[PDB]
A = this chain, B = another copy of it.
Amino acid sequence: AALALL
């Protein structure tokens, strides 16, 4: 699982 905030 992965999560990115940009």
Main secondary structure of the interface of A (DSSP, over half): strand
Q: How far is the CA of A1 from the CA of B6 in the complex (A)?
A: 5
Distance of A6 Cα from B2 Cα, bound (Å): 6
Q: Which residues of B contact A5 (CB under 8 A)?
A: 1-3, 6
Q: In the complex, which residue of chain B has the Cβ closest to the Cβ of A4?
A: B4
**Contact partners of A6 in chain B: CB under 8 A:** 1-5
Query: How many angstroms between the C-alpha atoms of A2 and B3 in the bound complex?
Result: 7
CA distance A2 to B1 in the complex (A): 9
Q: Return 9 A-B CB contacts under 8 Å, by A number.
A: A1-B4, A1-B5, A1-B6, A2-B4, A2-B5, A3-B5, A4-B4, A4-B6, A5-B6
